[PDB]
Amino acid sequence: QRDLYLSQSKSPPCGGNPTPEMNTFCRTAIPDFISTVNFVKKQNDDTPKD
Amino acid sequence: LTKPFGKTCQDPYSLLCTWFQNKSDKLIQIQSLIDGVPALGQDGVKQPDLSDNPQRQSVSGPLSSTVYGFVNNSMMVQLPGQPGIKPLTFANLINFKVDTSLYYMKHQDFDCGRVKILFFSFCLGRMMGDLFYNYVFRYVYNFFLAIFG
Amino acid sequence: LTANQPASFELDMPNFDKSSPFYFLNGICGTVKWNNISALNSTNQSDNKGLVTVGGAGSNSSMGANSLNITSSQLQTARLSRAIAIQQMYVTLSTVAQVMVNNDPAFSTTTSTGNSKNDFSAIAKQQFGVPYKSSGEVCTEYQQVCQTWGSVPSSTGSTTGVLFNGTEFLGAINDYNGIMMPTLNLIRQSKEFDKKSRDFIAEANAKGWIMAGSYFFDLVKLNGSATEDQFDTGTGLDKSSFDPTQLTKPFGKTCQDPYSLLCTWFQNKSDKLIQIQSLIDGVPALGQDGVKQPDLSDNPQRQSVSGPLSSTVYGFVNNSMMVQLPGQPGIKPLTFANLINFKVDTSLYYMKHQDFDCGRVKILFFSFCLGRMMGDLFYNYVFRYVYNFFLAIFGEMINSIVMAFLMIPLQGMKDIFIVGVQTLTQPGINPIVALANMGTMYINFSGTLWLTLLNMAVSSLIPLFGIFIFALIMMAMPLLMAWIGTMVSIGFVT
Amino acid sequence: SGTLWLTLLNMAVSSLIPLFGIFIFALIMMAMPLLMAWIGTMVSIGFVT
Amino acid sequence: SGTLWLTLLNMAVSSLIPLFGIFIFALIMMAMPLLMAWIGTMVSIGFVT
Amino acid sequence: SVPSSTGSTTGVLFNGTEFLGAINDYNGIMMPTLNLIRQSKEFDKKSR
Amino acid sequence: VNNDPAFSTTTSTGNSKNDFSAIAKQQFGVPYKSSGEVCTEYQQVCQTWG
Amino acid sequence: GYTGWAGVYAFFFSILIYTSMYLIIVQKAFTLIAHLPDKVLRWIG
């Protein structure tokens, strides 16, 4: 969807007069989703270090 | 995934809707990959019961190629180890010959009563019948029955 | 052969090779299931190399009381006996089905001479017939016995010749039973007296005097024994199913699985399989009511399908189940049915047909009754259809549930105590064991009746009307609970 | 006693008009203690005598 | 016995189907004496043992 | 596979043992921890 | 009530980003654990506010 | 050999009467506590 939007960077909504959230979406890339899930770090954060 | 969308999309994922401009096709495709609807019919496989079910039924045909169906089918195979699942002692002793086909609402064709708006000929009676009964009542009833089974 | 044979087999109809393009059509016309014979699952030597022996005495088994010997081919044809019998069923019913299909004028794509009265009905040019008593008169109720097969009177303005004697279905049934009889005979090969009745005595000396109590029942069959046709049960063909609606299942606004290829082939026009459905149970070629799948059990209160509806497959089966063959009768009407009278009528809740005021809406030079069309479409054809469909189901539903909730005390108790008195009245018959058998029969009947009652009570979930079959179970709970408690307490005691 | 009980059963079953029979259902539930008392009286009387 | 009772209550609650929801009531009442006999058997057995 | 699924048959990308294989992996990784947990067992001094 | 932008006589002169929602310009916040991490279930002890 | 769940009900009754008999054995075995002293007193007394 973002590629289809950026290929049309002469027409709304990535162009013209975008609403701020749409402008932010057009600007920001798509981070990796699988790479961010990590159970060990989450459990370590939840558990007190003591 | 398709929760926010509607007449105007609401919480808690309004930002996804505004990104997609209130279009849900890219996510109903996700749903159809997840459990089938609607690329393989309006109703398909549901979330499997992963408990020890000796009478589990394998899904067959196109529904075999969905995530939930694949998990259900995988749950039945036996590993190279010797079997360790005990089927119920008497499944035919307790029988429930209950069929939901008795309460099926069929697809009726209504009289196409043509109205002629100047030079526009169309029967709103057939459209009303197909919409409110053949597609609203019928789908709701079939949805209840499908969950019921 | 030494491995455990499959417990159940299923044959989905039609059958097609996986290579054939019509594999998706597998199972549209129903499915039939049959179990295996218990002569192989038990511990029994079996091999194809040479001679094979069957087991009798030695353990607690369902086999015969004597050890017999047969050959590998004999036992091979023995384990296939169910398959051969069911295939004989299929081959003998094939002619009947072919005659029935050729009867239908709709299926006759060739030019037809009859137009409106030269035939019998829109589903059959020639009438199948209805059961007749041994008087030449119309046999409506089963209680008045029916023996012959007579054509319906001139209700359609003409009398077409019949094509059946009403004995094809029962002819297939007793053909199947006759084919089955040799296998059950071979499996049932004294039987009431065994030498092993003594084997405990010596073992008793191994225990001592205190253990003499646990031998009591042995002594009962020790001083009891000294002083002292059939039809197949457990075939499992009840589990078979046949849903006529699966033919029109895929069709819709845009058709979908499972049989979507049928819809695509017919270009989303199911006007040709609805004729199949009307041949099956008579909708919509003969009204919108038809006759649903008949229940095939001991139902002396069975009601025959009269008129053109008799010319459908389900109606024909229901009518054929009524005729009494020249052989001995086997169904006796319940000795007290007027005792439990139900004057429930569904006509009190029927919704009529109402004429609405024509709402005259005028377009430039067009004019139509929008109000009348809305009224007679949304209510006279949508609300009316749903309500009348629920009532139509409920009619035969409550008939059957009332029959089942009526049949417990009279039939069950009377028959069980009659057989108990019969076995007790013969001098020499052991009274303790006879009472024990009476009690176990009581327990079996009471429990299986309770489970069937639960099954139908669940199956009475029709909207707007099942709530009061529910209320029926609640109002009957005291009296029916008394009946079942009597039965189970008697069984436990005896 | 049992003829009256069967008449009650028939009436209750035949009270199946929609949207309103649930309260005849409430009536039978509410009267179940009273009917149970009376019917038990008469039936136990007959059983004893 | 009680774990299975709790899961029975869970599924009976989880039925709650619009229109076809009365099925759980019909089955539960037609089975309450029999299922109650089973569960009371189990519970009393455990209590004596 | 299933022949004539939509008029033709295609290759299968699994062996039906990926989910169960993951389950066995989880159980095998879990076993050392529970073994350390469980570590006489048929007799105790407290009983006396 | 003073926090509600709907009750403010003057309308927004900038982007909606500087605001929080259509009911609050400054958010109220939620309870937080003693470690300052997002508190969702009360069974986990939540002490501070953020 | 009992057909149907007649064997199931037999199983119910057998385990019920097993624990029942266990109970009466325990109860009539535990009566000596107050059963023997009285008859001992009958003996010497």
CA distance C427 to C228: 9
* Strand ranges (E), chain B: 114-117, 120-123
Rounded-to-integer distance, Cα C283 and Cα C281, Å: 6
How far F19 CA lies from chain C's nearest CA (Å)? Answer: 27
3-state SS string over C204-219?
A: HHHHCCHHHHHHHHHH
Decide the pairing of beta strands C68-70 and C130-132: unpaired
Using CB atoms, pick whichever of C460, C463, C481 lies closest to residue E33.
C481
The candidate with the shortest Cα–Cα distance to B122, out of C270, C363, C358, is C363
Specify the long-range contacts of residues C153-161, CB closer than 8 Å, at least 24 apart: C155/C307, C155/C308, C156/C117, C156/C120, C156/C121, C156/C308, C157/C117, C158/C117, C158/C118, C158/C120, C159/C127, C160/C119, C160/C120, C160/C125, C160/C126, C160/C127, C161/C126, C161/C127
Lookup: tokens for B41: 């019919």
The Cα–Cα gap between C42 and C63 comes to 9
Identify the sign of the CA torsion G38, G40, G46, G49: positive
Structure tokens at C3: 């491995």
CA distance F29 to chain B (A): 18
Query: Judging by beta carbons within 10 Å of its beta carbon (0-12, 13-18, 19+), is residue C486 exposed, middle or buried?
Result: middle
Q: What is the DSSP string of E14-33?
A: HH--TTTTHHHHHHHHHHHH
SS3 C127: coil
Given its phi and psi angles, is residue B99 left (phi above 0), alpha (psi -120 to 50 degrees) or beta?
beta
In this complex, the residue of B106, B110, B115 whose CB is nearest that of residue C377 is B110
Q: Helix count (H) and strand count (E) of chain G?
A: 0, 2
Q: How far apart are CA A10 and CA A21, in angstroms?
A: 18
DSSP string, B84-101: -----S-TTTS-----GG
Residue B74 to residue F19, Cβ atoms within 8 A: yes
Among D40, D15, D44, CA closest to D28: D15
SS3 C69: strand
DSSP C396-447: HHHHHHHHHHHHIIIIIIHHHHHHHHHHHSSTTS-HHHHHHHHHHHHHHHHH
Interface check for B144 against chain E (CB to CB < 8 A): the answer is: yes
Instruction: Calculate the dihedral angle through the C-alpha atoms of C284, C290, C293, C299, rounding to the nearest 10 degrees.
Output: -170
Which two tokens mark C210?
């205190």
Q: Can you say whether the dihedral through the CA atoms of B45, B46, B47, B53 is positive or negative?
A: negative
* Binding-face residues of B in 51-70 toward C, CB within 8 A: 61-63
Give E-chain residues touching H23 at CB under 8 angstroms.
48
Q: What is the DSSP string of C228-245?
A: ---------GGG-B--GG
C-alpha to C-alpha distance for C270 and C255, rounded to whole angstroms: 11
Asked if C233 and C446 touch (Cβ cutoff 8 Å), the reply is no
Per DSSP, what are the bridge partners of residue C147?
A: none
Q: Residue C369, SS3?
A: strand
C-alpha distances in angstroms, B74 versus B57, B67, F26? 11, 10, 17
In terms of C-beta density within 10 A (0-12 exposed, 13-18 middle, 19 or more buried), how is residue B89 classed? exposed
Packing angle of the helix pair D21-48, C466-493 (nearest 10 deg): 30
What is the separation of C-alpha B127 from the centre of its chain, rounded to a whole number of angstroms? Answer: 24
How far C265 CA sits from the closest chain D CA (Å)?
Answer: 43
Considering only the beta carbons, identify the residue of C248, C270, C366 that sits closest to B115.
C366
Structure-determination technique: cryo-EM
Q: Which of E20, E29, E34 sits opposite C473 (nearest CB)?
A: E29
Could you tell me where the beta strands, DSSP code E, fall in C304-395?
360-362, 367-369
- Do C363 and B115 meet the contact criterion of CB atoms below 8 Å apart? yes
Please state, in angstroms and rounded to a whole number, the distance separating the CA atoms of residues B58 and B75. 9
C-chain CB neighbours of D18 within 8 Å are 349, 464-465
Nearest to C194 by CA among C169, C230, C216, C226: C226
Contact status, residue C355 vs residue B106, Cβ threshold 8 Å: no
Of all helices (H) and strands (E), which one includes residue B68?
Answer: helix B67-74
Instruction: In whole angstroms, give the CA distance from residue C276 to residue C281.
Output: 9
One-letter amino acid at B9 equals C
Chains that contact B by 3+ CB pairs under 8 Å? Answer: A, C, E, F, H
H5 closest CB neighbour out of C60, C61, C447: C447
Burial state string for C167-184 with b = 16 or more CB within 10 A and e = fewer than 16: ebbbbbbeebeebbbebb
Cβ contact E23:C454 at 8 Å: no
- Those residues whose C-beta lies under 8 Å from the C-beta of residue B80, and which sit 6 or more positions away, are none
CA-based nearest residue to C110, from C95, C125, C96 = C125
Helix orientation angle between C431-458 and C384-407, rounded to the nearest 10 degrees: 170
Separation of alpha carbons G2 and B139, rounded Å = 49
Enumerate residues 6+ apart whose C-beta is below 8 A from C493: C439
- Summarize chain B as % helix, strand, coil (round to 5): 40, 5, 55
Shortest distance between the Cα of C19 and any Cα of chain F, in A, equals 7
Give CA–CA dist H32/H29, Å, rounded.
7
Say if residues C140 and C304 touch (Cβ distance below 8 Å): yes
> Cis peptide before C105, with omega less than 30 degrees from 0?
no
Q: Is A9 exposed, middle or buried (0-12, 13-18, 19+ CB in 10 A)?
A: exposed
Which residues sit opposite C52 in a β-bridge? C70
| Angle ∠(B132,B135,B141) on CA atoms, nearest 5 | 100
Q: C360 has which bridge partners?
A: C369
- Contact (CB, 8 A) for B99 and B144: no
Q: CA-nearest residue of chain F to C260?
A: F6
Q: Residues of C76-105 as b/e, b for ≥16 C-beta within 10 angstroms?
A: eebbebbeebbebbeeeeeebeeebeebbb
Q: Does B137 touch chain E (CB under 8 A)?
A: no
For G10-17, which contacts have Cβ atoms below 8 Å and span 24 or more sequence positions?
Answer: G15/A20, G16/A20, G17/A20
Whole-angstrom Cα Rg for chain C: 29
User: Residue C30, Cβ neighbours under 10 Å: how many?
Assistant: 15
12-41 of H, contacting B, C-beta below 8 A: none
Task: Using CB atoms within 10 Å of the CB of residue H28, give its burial: 0 to 12 exposed, 13 to 18 middle, 19+ buried.
Answer: exposed
Q: What does this entry list as its resolution, in Å?
A: 3.6
C-alpha–C-alpha distance, residues B63 and B39, integer Å: 10
Q: Given F5, F14, F20, which is nearest B62 (Cβ)?
A: F5
Torsion sign across C-alpha atoms C270, C276, C280, C286: positive
Partner residues linked to C281 by β-bridges: none
Whether C479 and D22 lie within 8 Å, measured CB to CB = no
Closest of D48, C468, C62 to residue E22, by C-alpha: C468
Residue G20, min C-alpha distance to chain A (Å): 13
Interface probe for F, chosen from C15, C16, C22, C24 (most Cβ of F below 10 Å), is C24
Is residue C396 within 8 A of residue C292, CB to CB? The reply is yes
Which residues numbered 432-491 in C keep a CB inside 8 Å of some CB on E? 450, 453-454, 457-458, 460-461, 463, 466-467, 469-470, 473-474, 477, 481, 484
Asked if A24 and A5 touch (Cβ cutoff 8 Å), the reply is no
Euclidean distance between CA atoms C37 and C53, whole angstroms:
16
Q: Contacts of residue F5 in chain B, CB cutoff 8 Å?
A: 61-62
Q: Which residues of E are less than 8 Å from B147 in CB distance?
A: 17
Q: Diameter of chain C by CA atoms?
A: 111
Compute the count of residue pairs across chains A and B with CB atoms less than 8 Å apart: 12
Tokens 């109809």 map to which residue? C13
* Smallest Cα distance from C21 to chain F, Å: 6
- Could you give the CA distance from residue B3 to residue B11 in angstroms, rounded to a whole number? 9
Residue C449's CB: how many other CB atoms inside 10 A?
Answer: 20
Record: contact H4-C447, CB cut-off 8 A: yes
C-alpha span between C189 and G42 (Å, rounded): 73
Of A1, A19, A21, the CB nearest to B26: A1
Buried-exposed string C343-358: b where 16+ CB fall within 10 A, e elsewhere: ebebeebeeeeeeeee
**Phi, then psi, of C130 in degrees rounded to 5:** -130, 155
**What are the backbone dihedrals phi and psi of residue C361, each rounded to the nearest 5 degrees, phi first?**
-100, 135
Max distance between CA atoms of chain F, in angstroms, equals 77
Count of alpha carbons within 13 angstroms of residue C115, beta-carbon side: 0
| Residue pointed to by tokens 């009900």 | H9
Identify the bridge partners of residue B114 per DSSP, sorted by sequence position: B123
Q: What is the 3-state secondary structure (H, E, C) of D12-46?
A: HHCCCCCCCHHHHHHHHHHHHHHHHHHHHHHHHHH
